[PDB]
Amino acid sequence: VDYIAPWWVVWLHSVPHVGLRLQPVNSTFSPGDESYQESLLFLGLVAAVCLGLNLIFLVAYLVCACHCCITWTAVVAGLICCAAVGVGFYGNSETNDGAYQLMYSLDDANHTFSGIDALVSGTTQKMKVDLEQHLARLSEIFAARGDYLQTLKFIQQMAGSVVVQLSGLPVWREVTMELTKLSDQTGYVEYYRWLSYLLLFILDLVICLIACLGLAKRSKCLLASMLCCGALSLLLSWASLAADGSAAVATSDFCVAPDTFILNVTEGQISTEVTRYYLYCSQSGSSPFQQTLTTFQRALTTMQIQVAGLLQFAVPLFSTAEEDLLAIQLLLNSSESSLHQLTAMVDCRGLHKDYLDALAGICYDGLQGLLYLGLFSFLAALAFSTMICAGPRAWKH
Amino acid sequence: VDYIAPWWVVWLHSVPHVGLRLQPVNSTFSPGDESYQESLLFLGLVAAVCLGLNLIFLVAYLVCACHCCITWTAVVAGLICCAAVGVGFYGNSETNDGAYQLMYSLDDANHTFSGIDALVSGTTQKMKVDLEQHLARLSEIFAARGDYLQTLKFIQQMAGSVVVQLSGLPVWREVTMELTKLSDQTGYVEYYRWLSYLLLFILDLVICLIACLGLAKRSKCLLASMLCCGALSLLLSWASLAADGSAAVATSDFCVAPDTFILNVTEGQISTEVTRYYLYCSQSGSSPFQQTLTTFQRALTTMQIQVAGLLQFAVPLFSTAEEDLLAIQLLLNSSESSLHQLTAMVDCRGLHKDYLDALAGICYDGLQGLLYLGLFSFLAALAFSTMICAGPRAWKH
Ligand SMILES: *[C@@H]1O[C@H](CO)[C@@H](O[C@@H]2O[C@H](CO)[C@@H](O)[C@H](O)[C@H]2NC(C)=O)[C@H](O)[C@H]1NC(C)=O
Ligand SMILES: *[C@@H]1O[C@H](CO)[C@@H](O[C@@H]2O[C@H](CO)[C@@H](O)[C@H](O)[C@H]2NC(C)=O)[C@H](O)[C@H]1NC(C)=O
Ligand SMILES: *[C@@H]1O[C@H](CO)[C@@H](O[C@@H]2O[C@H](CO)[C@@H](O)[C@H](O)[C@H]2NC(C)=O)[C@H](O)[C@H]1NC(C)=O
Ligand SMILES: *[C@@H]1O[C@H](CO)[C@@H](O[C@@H]2O[C@H](CO)[C@@H](O)[C@H](O)[C@H]2NC(C)=O)[C@H](O)[C@H]1NC(C)=O
Ligand SMILES: *[C@@H]1O[C@H](CO)[C@@H](O)[C@H](O)[C@H]1NC(C)=O
Ligand SMILES: *[C@@H]1O[C@H](CO)[C@@H](O)[C@H](O)[C@H]1NC(C)=O
Ligand SMILES: *[C@@H]1O[C@H](CO)[C@@H](O)[C@H](O)[C@H]1NC(C)=O
Ligand SMILES: *[C@@H]1O[C@H](CO)[C@@H](O)[C@H](O)[C@H]1NC(C)=O
Numbered sequence: 051v052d053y054i055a056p057w058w059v060v061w062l063h064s065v066p067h068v069g070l071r072l073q074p075v076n077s078t079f080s081p082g083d084e085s086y087q088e089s090l091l092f093l094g095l096v097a098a099v100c101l102g103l104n105l106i107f108l109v110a111y112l113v114c115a116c117h118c119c120i121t122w123t124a125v126v127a128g129l130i131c132c133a134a135v136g137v138g139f140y141g142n143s144e145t146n147d148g149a150y151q152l153m154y155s156l157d158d159a160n161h162t163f164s165g166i167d168a169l170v171s172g173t174t175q176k177m178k179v180d181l182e183q184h185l186a187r188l189s190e191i192f193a194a195r196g197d198y199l200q201t202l203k204f205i206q207q208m209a210g211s212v213v214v215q216l217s218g219l220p221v222w223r224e225v226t227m228e229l230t231k232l233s234d235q236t237g238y239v240e241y242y243r244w245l246s247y248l249l250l251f252i253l254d255l256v257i258c259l260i261a262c263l264g265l266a267k268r269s270k271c272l273l274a275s276m277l278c279c280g281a282l283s284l285l286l287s288w289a290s291l292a293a294d295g296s297a298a299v300a301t302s303d304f305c306v307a308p309d310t311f312i313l314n315v316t317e318g319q320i321s322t323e324v325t326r327y328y329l330y331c332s333q334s335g336s337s338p339f340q341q342t343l344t345t346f347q348r349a350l351t352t353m354q355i356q357v358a359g360l361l362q363f364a365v366p367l368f369s370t371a372e373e374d375l376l377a378i379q380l381l382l383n384s385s386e387s388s389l390h391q392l393t394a395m396v397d398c399r400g401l402h403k404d405y406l407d408a409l410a411g412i413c414y415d416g417l418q419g420l421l422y423l424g425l426f427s428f429l430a431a432l433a434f435s436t437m438i439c440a441g442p443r444a445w446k447h
Numbered sequence: 448v449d450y451i452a453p454w455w456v457v458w459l460h461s462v463p464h465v466g467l468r469l470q471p472v473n474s475t476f477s478p479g480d481e482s483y484q485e486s487l488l489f490l491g492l493v494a495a496v497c498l499g500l501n502l503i504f505l506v507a508y509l510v511c512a513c514h515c516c517i518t519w520t521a522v523v524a525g526l527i528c529c530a531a532v533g534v535g536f537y538g539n540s541e542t543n544d545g546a547y548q549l550m551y552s553l554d555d556a557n558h559t560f561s562g563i564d565a566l567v568s569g570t571t572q573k574m575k576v577d578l579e580q581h582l583a584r585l586s587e588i589f590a591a592r593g594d595y596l597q598t599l600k601f602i603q604q605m606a607g608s609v610v611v612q613l614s615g616l617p618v619w620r621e622v623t624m625e626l627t628k629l630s631d632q633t634g635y636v637e638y639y640r641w642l643s644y645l646l647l648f649i650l651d652l653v654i655c656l657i658a659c660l661g662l663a664k665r666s667k668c669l670l671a672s673m674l675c676c677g678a679l680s681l682l683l684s685w686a687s688l689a690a691d692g693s694a695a696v697a698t699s700d701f702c703v704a705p706d707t708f709i710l711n712v713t714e715g716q717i718s719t720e721v722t723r724y725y726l727y728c729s730q731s732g733s734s735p736f737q738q739t740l741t742t743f744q745r746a747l748t749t750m751q752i753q754v755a756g757l758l759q760f761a762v763p764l765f766s767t768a769e770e771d772l773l774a775i776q777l778l779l780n781s782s783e784s785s786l787h788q789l790t791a792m793v794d795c796r797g798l799h800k801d802y803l804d805a806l807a808g809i810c811y812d813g814l815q816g817l818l819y820l821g822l823f824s825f826l827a828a829l830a831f832s833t834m835i836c837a838g839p840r841a842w843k844h
Contacts, residue, residue, distance in 0.1 A: 143540070158800075335784035344783060348748050390737060390790055391730075397791035403555075 097292030141422025151411025494689030538819025548808025
């Protein structure tokens with residue numbers, strides 16, 4: 051399963067990012083860049099211009115009608131509004147699902163990075179402090195024994211090699227903090243956006259239902275209030291279309307080159323080869339951690355051989371401080387367990403799956419949901435324009 | 448993230464399973480057992496009895512009305528039907544999402560098991576065939592050299608140890624086939640179920656819309672066909688409630704003890720320690736594969752030591768057919784790569800995540816969707832009962 055850009059992503063990416071004063075920006079995902087933000091603002095301003103044109107057209111139509119089948123038009127408008135609200139519910143659910151998929155992927159990546167850091171730090175601190183303490187305690191036990199201290203200093207050098215090899219592993223403390231911040235911000239924004247769109251759907255349904263009630267019961271003050279709220283809802287729906295279009299364009303622009311964006315943004319705290327390994331994930335047997343993991347496992351194996359040989363030969367001679375030998379053997383066993391867990395976590399599979407899940411959430415689900423919310427906004431605008439244009443005819447009966 | 452049974456699961460599991468002849472049957476999940484299937488059939492028969500009682504009540508009410516505000520009742524029935532169809536859409540989407548989550552989890556577990564089997568088989572066949580061929584070819588190269596053949600036979604014994612250790616790993620060929628069959632069946636059943644419920648929603652909405660149309664236009668002939676279709680839709684909705692209730696009870700009974708069910712069903716194909724390891728993720732415990740992976744890595748390290756020492760020493764003397772030594776070194780490098788990939792894949796994390804994702808799909812999403820579909824069925828039955836009971840009054844005006 052390798053990522054491939056969907057069709058709608060590459061259609062939306064083809065949308066000219068033209069900026070404010072009609073100057074073509076390069077249209078490559080780069081938030082913070084003035085030109086890209088200006089292109090998004092230009093899309094928002096285009097949607098606002100469409101809103102202004104629609105309001106002007108509605109005002110002109112009402113002026114012409116009031117200075118110069120309607121039930122069928124009202125029924126058609128209500129049906130179109132109901133279809134729009136259904137499409138909006140579908141799009142809102144899809145966008146929320148995509149955002150939550152991204153949140154889960156980020157949380158899983160954060161958990162894996164924190165686990166890698168925890169094992170690295172624990173193994174290093176253990177093999178330093180506890181091992182040096184045990185060897186120092188054994189130092190006096192093996193009194194006047196040249197070979198039995200040569201083997202202990204060999205153990206010390208091998209532990210130093212272990213610590214040196216582990217220290218060369220990437221530290222994900224910064225990356226965990228960035229992922230936590232991104233996850234919290236995504237959760238906050240997604241919650242507020244879903245709540246706002248749910249309130250918009252509820253308001254739209256209430257307005258349509260009360261307008262139908264006023265049509266049935268021939269209300270006078272009720273209908274005027276519903277038309278005022280209809281103008282307000284048309285304004286709000288065009289603003290929602292602006293937001294949905296800008297967000298969808300930005301999302302498609304990012305999703306065209308997600309690996310490129312991730313490589314560029316993570317040049318600081320993550321090495322290039324590690325990022326390429328976790329993003330493209332070649333099955334060609336080339337892992338940046340392979341050499342250090344092999345060195346660590348060889349060092350652990352060697353120390354186990356020396357400690358086992360010492361235990362086999364120290365019992366006939368001393369048999370006094372063998373509790374320290376068993377403690378060291380247990381420490382090496384736990385270190386090998388930590389080795390297996392680490393070489394499992396530093397593997398591509400989990401992080402590549404998390405990255406692919408995040409991309410699927412924010413492109414296959416989030417972007418489709420944004421498109422459907424834009425379709426909702428356009429359909430609601432059309433329905434409410436039809437409701438307002440057929441306004442005076444029902445008002446004058 | 449550890450699995451915990453939700454509240455609604457333990458409420459639904461508390462539902463008595465009393466069989467057909469009112470004999471209490473065990474509530475533990477056992478689809479193959481006859482008594483459990485009889486309890487599910489009893490739940491279906493209870494729902495059918497409720498359907499029959501509702502039909503009898505409707506017939507009695509119509510007989511009383513036809514042998515002896517209505518617009519408000521029709522509007523209330525239409526509103527309740529619309530709410531029911533919305534709840535049914537939500538439940539259908541949720542159930543489909545849960546089933547697809549289960550399908551994805553099963554596919555991921557299948558991919559991991561297939562990869563483990565592929566690495567094991569490839570490494571075994573390589574270390575047998577290619578290594579024996581290279582050593583046999585080197586046999587004549589090191590003619591009349593006892594030490595350089597003792598080292599080669601040592602390499603042969605270490606390769607045999609590698610093959611023996613790898614052969615002790617579980618073979619997932621059977622589990623792969625079972626997972627493929629389960630995923631295919633789940634996909635087929637989910638597709639057909641979603642299509643059937645979508646058709647039911649479409650039919651219900653069409654019937655309600657045409658009934659509302661005939662209410663205003665006073666077309667009695669169409670409303671007789673709509674009454675017949677309403678009786679049929681009430682029957683179908685009660686059948687759907689039967690299916691949803693039985694499936695929800697079965698799902699809750701399974702989900703109370705998913706670990707127990709998985710352990711009991713997978714007793715011969717998979718060793719019990721392996722199942723416990725991948726189900727209760729023993730991060731603080733131990734891995735059943737740790738000993739064999741340690742033996743395999745130690746063997747690879749040893750053989751690399753002998754081959755490196757031989758290459759360092761054989762080139763100055765012979766320098767003939769040393770491409771075989773480089774090929775053996777490349778083979779050992781690829782074998783260490785396969786070792787790292789295997790010890791990554793045989794880890795607990797990936798399979799435990801797949802299992803937890805499957806449980807979340809079929810319990811947090813599938814069961815909730817089934818409950819909402821049952822609520823849809825009950826609400827649609829109530830709405831159509833209200834539509835039929837207010838039948839003769841609108842018919843006779
Ligand atoms: C991401 O992982 C980090 C681990 O580094 C989590 O941070 C810890 O969170 C626990 C939970 O309250 C705190 O008790 C610790 O003090 C935190 N430690 C550090 C170093 O921050 C973090 O919560 C995780 N975030 C997510 C969203 O999973
Ligand atoms: C550290 O691990 C080793 C190997 O697992 C333990 O040595 C024994 O190894 C044999 C394998 O030939 C096992 O059958 C024994 O069960 C192991 N001993 C025990 C007590 O389990 C070694 O004992 C471990 N270290 C400690 C402190 O227990
Ligand atoms: C589960 O994994 C198995 C691998 O053992 C897949 O089976 C292979 O599928 C490919 C795809 O067409 C075939 O070309 C092979 O002949 C199959 N091999 C065997 C041994 O069956 C299977 O497709 C996977 N299933 C899912 C749902 O992912
Ligand atoms: C198998 O791997 C070893 C170790 O990676 C290769 O030996 C060289 O090891 C040093 C590390 O001290 C690397 O810097 C060299 O790049 C390695 N050599 C090469 C050619 O890359 C050994 O060469 C590998 N086997 C083969 C056939 O290339
Ligand atoms: C956009 O930027 C990329 C990278 O900086 C560059 O390769 C590309 O040529 C730019 N586009 C244009 C039209 O110059
Ligand atoms: C990242 O993108 C910016 C803007 O296109 C560019 O200036 C910079 O060189 C890029 N970084 C890398 C490492 O290519
Ligand atoms: C159901 O079976 C389990 C195990 O076979 C048993 O422990 C339990 O008591 C049984 N249920 C009843 C009600 O006896
Ligand atoms: C599996 O469940 C059946 C039915 O409850 C029981 O008879 C059997 O002993 C169980 N298997 C195991 C291994 O417990």
